[PDB]
Amino acid sequence: IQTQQLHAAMADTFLEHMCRLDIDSPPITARNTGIICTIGPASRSVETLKEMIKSGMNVARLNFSHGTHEYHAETIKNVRTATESFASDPILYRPVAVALDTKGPEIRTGLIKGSGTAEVELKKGATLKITLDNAYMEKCDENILWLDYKNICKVVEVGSKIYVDDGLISLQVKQKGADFLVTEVENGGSLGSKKGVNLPGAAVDLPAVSEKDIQDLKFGVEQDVDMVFASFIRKASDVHEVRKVLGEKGKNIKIISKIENHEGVRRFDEILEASDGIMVARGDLGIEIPAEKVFLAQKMMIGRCNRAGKPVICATQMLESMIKKPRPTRAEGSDVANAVLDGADCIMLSGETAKGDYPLEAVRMQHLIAREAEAAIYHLQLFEELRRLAPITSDPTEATAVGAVEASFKCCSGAIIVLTKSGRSAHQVARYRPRAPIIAVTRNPQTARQAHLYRGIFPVLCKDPVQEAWAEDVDLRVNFAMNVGKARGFFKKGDVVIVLTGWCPGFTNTMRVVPVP
Amino acid sequence: QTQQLHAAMADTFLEHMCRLDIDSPPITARNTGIICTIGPASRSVETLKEMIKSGMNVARLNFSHGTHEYHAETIKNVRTATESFASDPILYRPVAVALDTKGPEIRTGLIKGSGTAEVELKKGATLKITLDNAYMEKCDENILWLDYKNICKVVEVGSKIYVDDGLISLQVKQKGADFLVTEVENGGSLGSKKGVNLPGAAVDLPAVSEKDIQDLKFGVEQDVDMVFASFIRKASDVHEVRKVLGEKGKNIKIISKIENHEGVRRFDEILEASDGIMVARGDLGIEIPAEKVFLAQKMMIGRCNRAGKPVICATQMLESMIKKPRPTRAEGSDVANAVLDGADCIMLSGETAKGDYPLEAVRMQHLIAREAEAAIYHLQLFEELRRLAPITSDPTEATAVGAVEASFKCCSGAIIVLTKSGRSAHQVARYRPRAPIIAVTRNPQTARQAHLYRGIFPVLCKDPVQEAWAEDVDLRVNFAMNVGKARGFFKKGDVVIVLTGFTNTMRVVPVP
Amino acid sequence: QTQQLHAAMADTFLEHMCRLDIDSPPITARNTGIICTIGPASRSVETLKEMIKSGMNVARLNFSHGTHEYHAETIKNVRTATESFASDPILYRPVAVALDTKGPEIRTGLIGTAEVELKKGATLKITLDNAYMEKCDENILWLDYKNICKVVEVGSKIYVDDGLISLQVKQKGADFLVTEVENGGSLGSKKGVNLPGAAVDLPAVSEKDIQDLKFGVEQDVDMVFASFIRKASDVHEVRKVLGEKGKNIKIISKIENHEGVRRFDEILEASDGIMVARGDLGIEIPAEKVFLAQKMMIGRCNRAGKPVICATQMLESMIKKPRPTRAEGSDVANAVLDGADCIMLSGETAKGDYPLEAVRMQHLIAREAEAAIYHLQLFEELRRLAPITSDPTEATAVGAVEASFKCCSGAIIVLTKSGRSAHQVARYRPRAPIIAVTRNPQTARQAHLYRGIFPVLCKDPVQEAWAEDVDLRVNFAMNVGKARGFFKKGDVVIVLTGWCPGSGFTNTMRVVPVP
Amino acid sequence: QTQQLHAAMADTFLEHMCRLDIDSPPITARNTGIICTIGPASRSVETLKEMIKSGMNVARLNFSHGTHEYHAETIKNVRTATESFASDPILYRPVAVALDTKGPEIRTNICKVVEVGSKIYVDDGLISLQVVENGGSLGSKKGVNLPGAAVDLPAVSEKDIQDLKFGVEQDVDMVFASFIRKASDVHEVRKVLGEKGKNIKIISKIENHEGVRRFDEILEASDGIMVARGDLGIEIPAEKVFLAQKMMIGRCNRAGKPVICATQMLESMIKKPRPTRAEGSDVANAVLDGADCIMLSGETAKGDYPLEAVRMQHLIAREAEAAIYHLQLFEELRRLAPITSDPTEATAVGAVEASFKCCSGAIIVLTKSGRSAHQVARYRPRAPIIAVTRNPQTARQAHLYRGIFPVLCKDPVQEAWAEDVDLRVNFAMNVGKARGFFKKGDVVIVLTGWCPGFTNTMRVVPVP
Ligand SMILES: O=C([O-])C(=O)[O-]
Ligand SMILES: O=C([O-])C(=O)[O-]
Ligand SMILES: O=C([O-])C(=O)[O-]
Ligand SMILES: [Mg+2]
Ligand SMILES: [Mg+2]
DSSP states (O other): OOSTTHHHHTOSSHHHHHHTOOTTSOOOSOOOSEEEEEOOTTSOSHHHHHHHHHHTOOEEEEETTSSOHHHHHHHHHHHHHHHHTTTTOTTTOOOOEEEEEOOOSOOBBOOBTTBSSOOEEOOTTOEEEEEOOGGGTTOBOSSEEEBSOGGGGGTOOTTOEEEETTTTEEEEEEEOOSSEEEEEEEEOOEEOSSOBEEOTTSOOOOOSSOHHHHHHHHHHHHTTOSEEEEOSOOSHHHHHHHHHHHTTTTTTSEEEEEEOSHHHHHTHHHHHHHSSEEEEEHHHHHHHSOGGGHHHHHHHHHHHHHHHTOOEEEESSTTGGGGTOSSOOHHHHHHHHHHHHHTOSEEEESSTTTTOSOHHHHHHHHHHHHHHHHHTSOHHHHHHHHHHTSOOOOOHHHHHHHHHHHHHHHTTOSOEEEEOSSSHHHHHHHTTOOSSOEEEEESOHHHHHHGGGSTTEEEEEOOSOOOSSHHHHHHHHHHHHHHHHHHHTSOOTTOEEEEEEOSOOOOOOEEEEEEOO | OOTTHHHHTOSSHHHHHHTOOTTSOOOSOOOSEEEEEOOTTTOSHHHHHHHHHHTOOEEEEETTSSOHHHHHHHHHHHHHHHHTTTTOTTTOOOOEEEEEOOOSOOBBOOBSSSTTOOEEOOTTOEEEEEOOGGGTTOBOSSEEEBSOTTGGGTOOTTOEEEETTTTEEEEEEEEOSSEEEEEESSOOEEOSSOBEEOTTSOOOOOSSOHHHHHHHHHHHHTTOSEEEETTOOSHHHHHHHHHHHTTTTTTSEEEEEEOSHHHHHTHHHHHHHSSEEEEEHHHHHHHSOGGGHHHHHHHHHHHHHHHTOOEEEESSTTGGGGTSSSOOHHHHHHHHHHHHHTOSEEEESSTTTTOSOHHHHHHHHHHHHHHHHHTSOHHHHHHHHHHTSOOOOOHHHHHHHHHHHHHHHTTOSOEEEEOSSSHHHHHHHTTOOSSOEEEEESOHHHHHHGGGSTTEEEEEOOOOOOSSHHHHHHHHHHHHHHHHHHTTSOOTTOEEEEEEOOOOEEEEEEOO | OOTTHHHHTOSSHHHHHHTOOTTSOOOSOOOSEEEEEOOTTTOSHHHHHHHHHHTOOEEEEETTSSOHHHHHHHHHHHHHHHHTTTTOTTTOOOOEEEEEOOOSOOBBOOOOOOOEEEOTTOEEEEEOOGGGSSOOOSSEEEBSOTTGGGTOOTTOEEEOSTTOSEEEEEEEOSSEEEEEEEEOEEEOSSOBOBOTTSOOOOOSSOHHHHHHHHHHHHTTOSEEEETTOOSHHHHHHHHHHHTTTTTTSEEEEEEOSHHHHHTHHHHHHHSSEEEEEHHHHHHHSOGGGHHHHHHHHHHHHHHHTOOEEEESSTTGGGGTSSSOOHHHHHHHHHHHHHTOSEEEESSTTTTOSOHHHHHHHHHHHHHHHHHTSOHHHHHHHHHHTSOOOOOHHHHHHHHHHHHHHHHTOSOEEEEOSSSHHHHHHHTTOOSSOEEEEESOHHHHHHGGGSTTEEEEEOOSOOOSSHHHHHHHHHHHHHHHHHHHTSOOBTBEEEEEEOSSTTOOSOOEEEEEEOO | OOTTHHHHTOSSHHHHHHTOOTTSOOOSOOOSEEEEEOOTTTOSHHHHHHHHHHTOOEEEEETTSSOHHHHHHHHHHHHHHHHTTTTOTTTOOOOEEEEEOOOSOOBOOGGGTOOTTOEEEETTTTEEEEOOOBOOOOOSSOBEEOTTSOOOOOSSOHHHHHHHHHHHHTTOSEEEETTOOSHHHHHHHHHHHTTTTTTSEEEEEEOSHHHHHTHHHHHHHSSEEEEEHHHHHHHSOGGGHHHHHHHHHHHHHHHTOOEEEESSTTGGGGTOSSOOHHHHHHHHHHHHHTOSEEEESSTTTTOSOHHHHHHHHHHHHHHHHHTSOHHHHHHHHHHTSOOOOOHHHHHHHHHHHHHHHTTOSOEEEEOSSSHHHHHHHTTOOSSOEEEEESOHHHHHHGGGSTTEEEEEOOSOOOSSHHHHHHHHHHHHHHHHHHHTSOOTTOEEEEEEOSOOOOOOEEEEEEOO
8 A cells, every 4th residue: 555645645636546546545644734732730740741852842832811920931831941951952853933823912801719720610591791890800700700890891782792712602791780790601611710801892991002912922022932823803904903012123024914803804905915824713713703714714824934935823712622632633633634635834722732731642633634634635726726816026036945745746855955054945835735855954053943833844954164165064954864764754865855055155046856875 | 685695706715715694694595404313302292392393303212211101102192293283284284203223232231229319420430331121120329230131242451431422431451251340530429321322342242133123123113204223333334124014114214323432434435335324423422432422423424425325414413402592603514514414404313302492492493594594615526416416317316416406597486396205306315505495295294294304384285186187286386386485495486496207397487 | 339428427627638549439410500601603402402411501691792683683592592491490401691701801902803913122112193003013902991091100010902002101102102022922803901910990880781781671681691790889789770670680890800809709698609710810910819719709709608610711712623631620629619609711611613512511529529628627618607596487598508418408399489499408508409499480490509409490380279289390390300310209309499388488398218 | 018918827728718819929039939931942951041040950961862971962052051150159040950751652562552542642642542532733753642552662762761771871960761550660761760860769650540540659759749740641531640740749738848840831932022921820739739849841841932831930939838738738747747756857847837936937957968957848847948068969859848948059168167167158148138038137947957967957047
């Protein structure tokens, strides 16, 4: 039996491509889809972080909706300690990126009985009074809930719907007031502490980048984070507000815009052009818009991101049951596989790794599903379509990238080795979605960390000193990439690989089809 | 724009995705059938009436549990709620009845103590699986009885044993002809009569057991519309089910359930022998690695679409809705991608049998499937189905593919097909048109069995046969006109396709 | 297998080419209409009879020459030869009459069959003095375009005999032109003249054209080939001249210059059809660009569902020889493969020595080319590019063609009054021949403009029961296909009819076995 | 826009036709080679010089007429005219020499192969006979065709053996083998050429039904194919020739072997200064079919306007090359290409893909034998392939492939391979600039090796 679903790859129709998908055809060793994991109490120790990197974590996500600046600074220190514990072997060292997820214009409840882990049961048809009196921030119960959004009574109306936690608890405003709302519980359950609140039909007037967000962003600039997941972005000027706060010191920090509402979907095109990447944050999105329409927004945003060549992240509840169970549901396995088939550069875990009981199992399961799904990609149709929709340009590097991907398909290349300084040449290869893994050799540690945003880029950080002869320096990094693929099992001596370098000390314009040793 | 028609005109699948519009409302008609498992939560006539209104098309009865007395009351309640809408044939919705056989299953004994007595299995503990029937009703943390008497002949040291949907995992360390000491790998609250899986073993249990025979015969007496045959491994298994149904139940459809590696490997011969396929991801996710299930699902749905047989994607599609009133983002995506794969039917098993939100589950499947039907890249699917269609001289196939083509060119409100056995309407559903298929029939069984096919909206006509054949056809056609008008599928001045008669007449007619 | 069905099953156009089999015989039916120019070599009733037997469907009358009496006799002979087969409606082939306009032509003077040798590099003076009209020589030349000096410039090119003689304008006199011969040759009398880069100021419809068009309305012509159409307003002038009496006369606009190509879209919308008139076009634009205009116009006509004619010099060597050249054989096949509804002969039939051999050769090539069409790709593209509409006939038509591919129908039988339902089927280009049954003799004749339509004229009286009248005409189409070899009983065909007497639209499709 | 780039972006072939623009000017480079038959009208050194200036790439010598001294002289005039431009290596265009064999010809055991009622055709099918049907003017020593008969004449006669060895001694670049009917016939030609002429390309001419029926054996055994429509149009029905032409051109494109469309492409230009509309369509459609080369045989040997015929083919081929639906053609050639791990094929297809992405002005290929240039032309790029070589034979033989513009580098080999590469690459830059293919600032694709022997390096560089 052939491997990597190569029999399905030869199908002349997408229907026959489906008919040839073989569970007995093993995939390749390399996994092209990046894995972003949210760090929390269940994954903050250096010990867990080490195994998580070994399990397939590429980006550590820090959710600034919780915790103080000292809490996150320790998380960053632990991430770097666990990551650098493998730095002794540059061939096996896997770079790990650090991502700052902003709180954003969030609405959160108060503390229930005074404990963040405490909870209180709610019943259907019961009455719960929402208050803005700060005398009940930590005195929330089954009858009084405190909110942090002071202007709620001016944006919701009688008969409006209010959702708590992840849309699980629903409330309808029956009575209004100056600083209180009397709502009826429809969908009862356990109400916890500091849970998220959504007002779908309302136009929340909270700042896209609040003062806390500005302070949190400056903290990220000082901690040398690699990217920013900016929450509740609904327009391009919001993306710009984040970039100005990052200022000159953080020019190279990637801004990933999170689409979590209808306006963000409506204004997606202007948002995508202004951002470095997009996150389909299905948690809030699944509450702001009807649940049955979320898959339309996901496939649309991933499609437009592939067309523009910018990274897109599918996130939230991909393996939600693994928070309490060691194995996912069949729906969860399909969701991860379908996200990769959609064309998502990265898949995310947020809860399965931050607080769940099986954080390692969740990361390995994502690694396994993404690997199987990448082989099931209909590369024949995907590559030609990406070719037909690519604007014609006289940029020599873009021609080198598409020429490398085409050559990698013709000879079934073991890898595409790209020597890059900023990552751009490597990104231009990933935009055409080659089957072969992209080994991006760089001396810049930031671009090595940021390379995980693009599908298929395996960044390797060269710590060897710069040779005086440029041809020797190039040959060093290529040989460095050769040893990485050999040691990681991507290729072996005698296999064929594509090598992307420059010809003279500017941009990658040289393409070589070389044997491995 | 509506029906995602701006995306439907894209010349590339990538642009078809880019044009998916959450503000583009779908049509009223919902093409994908919804099969619901009946249990304590949805067994009552009053709840069953709401189930039909919520969008339920097929009632599924899991014979792995319950007596014949229990299921006969379920079937009695299903027909009572269904026939309570029979006073209006325009609005009457036919509901099929499906029997899910137990099959070659492996289940644990009753834990010691109460019937609800559960035990706890801790990771790093030992457990001795036994056949001694003395512990059949005396299971605990140390001993555990199984109903598979040949387990010691197919398993060896180092193999894995799964209990309770693979949530509990065991590793056998020392094997004997009577005892099997094992090491708990995961662990959890272990209950009674829980299913057991042996992935690396070749279980030699009968495909159609003694209990399966009496259940199948019982299904024939209860006039069931279809049978779901569990753990079908080879085409010879399908023939055994057909043999039991015999002459009395020759018209009952056999939907083979693929649940193991052997069934996937022999899917071609199983599909040829069966009337349909159920991708039963529950056991399949335990018999083969979980990360490979989506390959088997997309393979089986594709091959069934290629063969024109109905395929069902099942199990845990909206699992979190058992306890919660809203699904997860992965579950909403799982339903949509199942419909985008090409699945004729989607199923609920626990979300409707024992869950706290059975009507919400059905309602959610209705919303996602209708939304996913409009997002189907009909342009590429039709071309590929035509190209890959086996060449025939059958006049009925040329008429069927002509009606679907004509339904695209004019974006018809529906395709009205007059049929007795349903084969005419099935030949239209094979090419997967966007417009709904209003299949008018007088055969009650045909109207119930029609739910297995995508897009077929069956309507039962109880009018007597007129002497003049042209008089009778015009009545059935007008009965379909009033149905599509009442259900909001089309309106006066809209254009629909009519298929009459072998079926050889195709008409484009404005709605009166 | 036959009709290149192995090449038709190819999944790529390259493999479709690789499977083209010279040993795969085509079907009996020929879908491309053949238009033949009548002249001294083909005007007799006897010769016209053999032309119909050889495959002639439309008779073209070139009104650049001949008087109204000469042409009236031609039509009488055409109708005499055509009606000589009227005794058997099963084998009767309708024949159309087409009037080719004189148009804004420029013609030289008179030099008694006298010929003058023009030498390269010599000086040739073009004058407008009507005193040199009958005295044309190697030194002085007279034209009938009295406004030539105001539209041509110094350095412009002038062509004098179907592009054979080339001239370059060196000086611009008060009422004359001083040119330099570039491509010399034998200069005759009253030869056509082309001014490529100039904006000719001649009326689109001249006084002679008005009378010749009125003559066409009175002689009951089926179509008009309107010469040198350059804009939509020209087509309207032709439509207004035809008036109410000739409202149903199809106007085929002839594209013969750059402006006609540049403004093609406005011309096509206003016309009933298009002719790629490559004679003048090959002189007004560079010859190497003509195939670009030909394939563009044929493509846009296929997209709009309007008839297109490829014309001029398709078998030019057959004027003097009994066999065509390899370039001529390829040209006809490529015109059919491009998507042309009709192919034309103009000279190979009017004055050549082998008029019948030219008609049979077009019939043979068109039949072979029709089988080599990549119907798989063509139908898919025509399907994807077809505007979505709620017209019941359009849905029925595309459904019939789809069904004919699914079952390899032997034919598509269409019952039509005006021809529209048959035209709507032909626009999707089915492989099977379309048998259009009609009682209207004009729609039977005009149907030859559309590819694949085999018109048959039913002379039986209208039955009182509509179902009997439908069954009569359908059975008539069955006997026609049987006698002509389109199918044998047991074959499958598609039948397009109405549903009620007086529905007003073709809405019923039946896949029936052949009687 | 230019080069029919608006029509190139169409998503369907029908829309590609609808967008063909007579006002969209083509590029300067002409990719289709032009083969001209030399005769009394084109043998002078003066005329041959103008013939090269008009666009002639291959000189064809028809050994059906003339003695060895006539043909030996003709080669001398061709080489004299060709080398008259050798003083400037940037403007020198190599010219190939082709030997067209007489073959098993019949000209005015016949009684043992025909029967009563059989057809006999004389001249170019102009006179018909039944054992007179189509009368006419009969000349001396005219060709005769027996369509339904199985002629038992030797595939390679004694005259052919002596004529083929004569080609080996005159250093011809290729042989046009007439009336090839089987693979064993092609092998007979290779044996006569022997070891001394192993590198002489054999182009098999398909002129009868058996040749079409046995086409697959002939393509595998030959270096190239000629659709010789003259004899083919008499042996098989005239209306069926376009089927054989499109079949043979397709199978050659699939196999990556050169194919020549020949005979009567501009036949009326023997006596007239302008072609017919059918002739213009024939040349353009042959290029659209995928023909590597187009031929003239009579329009250049004896006609009154040999130069005008060469320029007209040059103009039509350039116009037709822009009208090719490259989008579908490249995708189909890619999907139908056997999967291989050969770095040169991966390098070649990557260069063609990159040339489409940046609309490159040229694809510069540094090659010794021509293989790397041939592998690029098989994927049919829109951009011209400038093949830089030091081998003079491969420069002449490169004209058989569509799009290859050969340039002969006479500069000495530099010691550092990087300097030799930079020398030859800049040589290609000066050639394309001097010919108007590109200008400074344009982008081109450069194909070289990586070490001082497979071509594996591709560079996307601006024109200096
Ligand atoms: O913020 C998020 O990640 C979300 O809403 O899922
Ligand atoms: O006048 C014409 O018909 C032409 O130019 O072909
Ligand atoms: O001999 C030839 O070249 C021909 O017949 O075309
Ligand atoms: Mg956050
Ligand atoms: Mg005229």
